[PDB]
Amino acid sequence: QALQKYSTDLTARAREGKLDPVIGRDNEIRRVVQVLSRRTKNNPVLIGEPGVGKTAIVEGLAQRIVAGDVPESLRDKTIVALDLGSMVAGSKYRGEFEERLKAVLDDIKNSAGQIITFIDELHTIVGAGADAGNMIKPMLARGELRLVGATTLDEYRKHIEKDAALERRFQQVYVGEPSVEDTIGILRGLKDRYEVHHGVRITDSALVAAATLSDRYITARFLPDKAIDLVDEAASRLRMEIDSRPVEIDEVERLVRRLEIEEMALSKEEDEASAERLAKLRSELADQKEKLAELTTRWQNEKNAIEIVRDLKEQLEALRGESERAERDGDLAKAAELRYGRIPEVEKKLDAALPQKEEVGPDDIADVVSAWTGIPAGRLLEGETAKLLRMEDELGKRVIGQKAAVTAVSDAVRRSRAGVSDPNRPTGAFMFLGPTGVGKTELAKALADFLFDDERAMVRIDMSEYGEKHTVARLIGAPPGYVGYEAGGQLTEAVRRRPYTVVLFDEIEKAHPDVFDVLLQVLDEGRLTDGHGRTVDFRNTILILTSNLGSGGSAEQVLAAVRATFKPEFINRLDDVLIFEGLNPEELVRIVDIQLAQLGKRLAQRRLQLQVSLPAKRWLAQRGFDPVYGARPLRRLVQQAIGDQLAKMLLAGQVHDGDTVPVNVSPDADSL
Amino acid sequence: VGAGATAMDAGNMIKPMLARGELRLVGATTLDEYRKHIEKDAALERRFQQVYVGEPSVEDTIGILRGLKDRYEVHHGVRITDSALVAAATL
Amino acid sequence: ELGKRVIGQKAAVTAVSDAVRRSRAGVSDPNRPTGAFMFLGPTGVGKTELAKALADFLFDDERAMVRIDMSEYGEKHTVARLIGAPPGYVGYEA
Ligand SMILES: Nc1ncnc2c1ncn2[C@@H]1O[C@H](COP(=O)(O)OP(=O)(O)OP(O)(O)=S)[C@@H](O)[C@H]1O
Numbered sequence: 001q002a003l004q005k006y007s008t009d010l011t012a013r014a015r016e017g018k019l020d021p022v023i024g025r026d027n028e029i030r031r032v033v034q035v036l037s038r039r040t041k042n043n044p045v046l047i048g049e050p051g052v053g054k055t056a057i058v059e060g061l062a063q064r065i066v067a068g069d070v071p072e073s074l075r076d077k078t079i080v081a082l083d084l085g086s087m088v089a090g091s092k093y094r095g096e097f098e099e100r101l102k103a104v105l106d107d108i109k110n111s112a113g114q115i116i117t118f119i120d121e122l123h124t125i126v127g128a129g130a131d132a133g134n135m136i137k138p139m140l141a142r143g144e145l146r147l148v149g150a151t152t153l154d155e156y157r158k159h160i161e162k163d164a165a166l167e168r169r170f171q172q173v174y175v176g177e178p179s180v181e182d183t184i185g186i187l188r189g190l191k192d193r194y195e196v197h198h199g200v201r202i203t204d205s206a207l208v209a210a211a212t213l214s215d216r217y218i219t220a221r222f223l224p225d226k227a228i229d230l231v232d233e234a235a236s237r238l239r240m241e242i243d244s245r246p247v248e249i250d251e252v253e254r255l256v257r258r259l260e261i262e263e264m265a266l267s268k269e270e271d272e273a274s275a276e277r278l279a280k281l282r283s284e285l286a287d288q289k290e291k292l293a294e295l296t297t298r299w300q301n302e303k304n305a306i307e308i309v310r311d312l313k314e315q316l317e318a319l320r321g322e323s324e325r326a327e328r329d330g331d332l333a334k335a336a337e338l339r340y341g342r343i344p345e346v347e348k349k350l351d352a353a354l355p356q357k358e359e360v361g362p363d364d365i366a367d368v369v370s371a372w373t374g375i376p377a378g379r380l381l382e383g384e385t386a387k388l389l390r391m392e393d394e395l396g397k398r399v400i401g402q403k404a405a406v407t408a409v410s411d412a413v414r415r416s417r418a419g420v421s422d423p424n425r426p427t428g429a430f431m432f433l434g435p436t437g438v439g440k441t442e443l444a445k446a447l448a449d450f451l452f453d454d455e456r457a458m459v460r461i462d463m464s465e466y467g468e469k470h471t472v473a474r475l476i477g478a479p480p481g482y483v484g485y486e487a488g489g490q491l492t493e494a495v496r497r498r499p500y501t502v503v504l505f506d507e508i509e510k511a512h513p514d515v516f517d518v519l520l521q522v523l524d525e526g527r528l529t530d531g532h533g534r535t536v537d538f539r540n541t542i543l544i545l546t547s548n549l550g551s552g553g554s555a556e557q558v559l560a561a562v563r564a565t566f567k568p569e570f571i572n573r574l575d576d577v578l579i580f581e582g583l584n585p586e587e588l589v590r591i592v593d594i595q596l597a598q599l600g601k602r603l604a605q606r607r608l609q610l611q612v613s614l615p616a617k618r619w620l621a622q623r624g625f626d627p628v629y630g631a632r633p634l635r636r637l638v639q640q641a642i643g644d645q646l647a648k649m650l651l652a653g654q655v656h657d658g659d660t661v662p663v664n665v666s667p668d669a670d671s672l
Numbered sequence: 673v674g675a676g677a678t679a680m681d682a683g684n685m686i687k688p689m690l691a692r693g694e695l696r697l698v699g700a701t702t703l704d705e706y707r708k709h710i711e712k713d714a715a716l717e718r719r720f721q722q723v724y725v726g727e728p729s730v731e732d733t734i735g736i737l738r739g740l741k742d743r744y745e746v747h748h749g750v751r752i753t754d755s756a757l758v759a760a761a762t763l
Numbered sequence: 764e765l766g767k768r769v770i771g772q773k774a775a776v777t778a779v780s781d782a783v784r785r786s787r788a789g790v791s792d793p794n795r796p797t798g799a800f801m802f803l804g805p806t807g808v809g810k811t812e813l814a815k816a817l818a819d820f821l822f823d824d825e826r827a828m829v830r831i832d833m834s835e836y837g838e839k840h841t842v843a844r845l846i847g848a849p850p851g852y853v854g855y856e857a
């Protein structure tokens with residue numbers, strides 16, 4: 001009777017149907033049984049990575065015993081769940097724990113096999129000492145107490161295989177992880193258990209996506225655990241949407257309810273600097289209050305348009321009663337008039353009346369796997385499509401020219417959002433090289449802005465420091481048992497948290513030609529492993545490789561120089577190698593505008609503008625010279641001409657805030 | 673992880689109750705230790721869902737300050753101008 | 764059947780196939796790996812695709828082949844990455 005204090009009853013719990021269904025895994029259950037019912041040393045231990053299903057098999061065996069599908073050698077037997085935790089609770093006196101464990105052991109032995117002790121997490125049995133988990137070695141080798149355990153695959157070799165005197169008494173049962181085709185079946189069986197918990201309904205076209213999708217994105221965790229969670233969270237989110245107002249009607253309202261308070265408290269400031277701040281927040285407040293009511297009206301357009309059709313469905317039901325009564329009265333004329341007329345016509349009408357949010361679908365799964373792990377996998381929800389359609393106009397605001405590159409960098413993004421690219425390869429990995437000062441670094445910074453709205457959220461590594469072959473370990477971590485090892489890589493451990501950034505290998509031709517060979521398998525597979533032995537997936541980034549090879553050759557004095565610097569096995573991995581071209585005098589008059597815009601923006605910190613005249617605005621370009629240093633010298637000329645005397649004046653009085661000074665071309669130089 | 677040791681016995685007594693969702697256990701830990709202590713014990717990490725929290729920008733820090741610009745203004749017997757908030761959030 | 768994923772290179776598909784039946788028939792030597800041979804040739808021919816096709820013919824899941832890339836093991840001290848660490852060092856329980 002000591003077991004009533006230190007153990008619960010798995011089989012009794014399964015009798016009232018308080019466990020979950022168990023599907024598949026016939027070989028494993030049959031092996032567990034046929035090992036559990038032998039003469040001596042009859043005690044299995046399940047094993048395998050955490051998440052694959054190892055307690056579900058014991059629970060399935062319990063349900064199977066309650067059913068009666070096991071042979072006579074096992075029919076009518078109770079499985080007890082031992083608990084080493086609740087036995088060492090109060091045992092401060094020198095024999096309490098030994099006494100308790102002895103009582104439990106003798107009470108199990110006293111039965112005739114009516115009891116099967118099932119320890120979960122049995123790797124905890126090595127402790128309890130202070131001669132503990134050692135008084136069970138006698139009874140184990142004789143098969144008296146049946147033991148059933150479950151420990152993850154890599155604490156076994158850490159807590160048990162140390163004690164081979166013990167792991168001899170145990171029979172191993174390897175539990176391999178399932179595949180998608182059987183995870184589909186497991187989900188199809190489990191659906192109803194969550195359908196009742198969350199008062200919603202779940203589509204099978206969604207149970208398929210919750211497994212096909214969660215196998216190529218969330219690669220850190222194992223099968224089953226990583227496909228049930230999407231379903232559960234999606235159902236919970238849909239229930240939240242059902243109860244209160246839906247999302248995207250909630251975020252806008254919340255943020256407006258804050259902008260209001262902000263502008264209210266900003267209205268009572270006694271300054272002129274805040275006067276332009278109150279005059280900008282007051283515009284976004286209106287811009288957002290517009291969309292709130294627009295989306296609010298769009299909500300009723302669907303809430304009541306479908307709602308009017310509810311009477312017609314009931315009307316369709318009324319038509320079915322009408323056909324019933326037509327056939328009651330012998331009204332053949334109405335029988336078909338309802339069967340082929342009214343009822344089917346109202347049915348086509350009602351099919352047309354269907355607006356679209358009352359059951360999870362193959363898109364809420366994508367929404368959850370996008371909120372988690374950050375990788376965008378959706379359907380281009382009507383706002384992203386318009387923006388993606390004009391990108392070479394959105395990148396053109398920072399880069400000027402280079403349509404050769406902007407028509408290819410922005411190409412591997414569209415055909416990746418449209419669900420067409422290869423599923424296991426980087427979204428794009430191409431190296432573009434050309435003369436200096438053209439913008440080959442500015443493009444990979446203008447692009448990263450277009451996605452995350454932050455030019456610094458990308459992983460940038462400078463490949464001019466890797467001048468020695470031994471400096472590779474900086475980005476791949478150091479092998480175990482060395483100085484810096486519990487720090488991992490630096491390239492690797494930076495992508496394992498946000499697998500969406502755009503990595504940028506800057507100035508690649510300077511690195512010693514073995515960093516190339518390390519890079520060789522990053523392309524074409526998107527995988528590498530740091531010291532700890534963790535594979536990291538690069539199948540979503542955009543690998544970009546700057547360079548300065550050739551340096552002046554037209555096309556065959558550089559394309560014959562990169563061939564003699566890289567190997568074919570490496571050049572073959574990349575996508576098309578882009579060639580940048582120099583700057584014509586025409587396409588510099590716009591860089592002038594961009595530079596002056598940036599300068600004025602930086603001078604907005606003092607409420608200080610400045611006017612510019614087209615003569616000087618084109619004289620700057622006319623002194624944009626020497627198509628051998630690109631568009632860099634213009635950046636020095638601007639601050640030699642304008643900013644120099646502007647700063648010499650700004651600290652000598654005669655210029656203050658709110659002012660404005662126009663530049664005008666003196667016969668040779670610029671005079672304010 | 674290492675609640676009470678001596679040979680692992682404690683700190684995983686809640687590992688069974690976590691799975692059935694008995695307790696809810698919201699917690700917050702830094703980022704360069706979740707892979708130094710927990711990730712090493714992937715049997716337990718499996719029961720945790722991660723909610724990555726990125727750093728905000730200046731435009732949102734300005735709002736956070738504009739909302740928090742009362743507790744300090746009270747604790748110290750002074751007043752604070754919004755220009756100070758903007759200049760601080762920039763510098 | 765290997766001809767469904769790899770094309771040509773019958774000279775290699777034969778010598779790969781004749782290394783599995785020679786172990787099923789209980790004939791090959793019992794003290795040597797069940798077959799250990801090296802591919803080499805020009806790039807982009809299949810020398811990596813054939814290993815994947817073979818590793819799927821036997822398990823029906825391409826991810827079930829232990830795979831290590833020899834492009835990182837550039838120095839002696841990295842050998843300990845595939846053998847563990849000597850007794851009493853930093854990473855020893857791994
Ligand atoms: N064959 C299966 N049939 C039904 N549900 C399953 C099956 N395999 C796994 N599950 C579910 O997936 C989850 C896996 O839970 P467990 O198998 O208990 O985890 P585990 O395999 O014990 O790994 P550890 O070591 O205990 S963390 C649970 O929610 C199970 O209900």
Ligand SMILES: Nc1ncnc2c1ncn2[C@@H]1O[C@H](COP(=O)(O)OP(=O)(O)OP(O)(O)=S)[C@@H](O)[C@H]1O
Pocket residue numbers: 398399400401435436437438439440441442443546547548591630631632635
């Ligand atoms: N085509 C261009 N479009 C826009 N800005 C440009 C262009 N060319 C140069 N610039 C400006 O000059 C700088 C860009 O130079 P970078 O691209 O960083 O140098 P680079 O192109 O990497 O050449 P190297 O080989 O690295 S010195 C920025 O300040 C840009 O504003």
Ligand SMILES: Nc1ncnc2c1ncn2[C@@H]1O[C@H](COP(=O)(O)OP(=O)(O)OP(O)(O)=S)[C@@H](O)[C@H]1O
Pocket residue numbers: 569572768769770771805806807808809810811812813
């Ligand atoms: N003989 C082939 N049959 C089918 N596909 C092939 C063949 N050769 C190459 N491929 C394709 O090319 C890719 C595989 O290239 P591989 O030749 O396996 O690379 P590799 O063998 O490692 O050569 P290197 O020198 O290491 S780059 C896949 O996309 C295949 O579809």
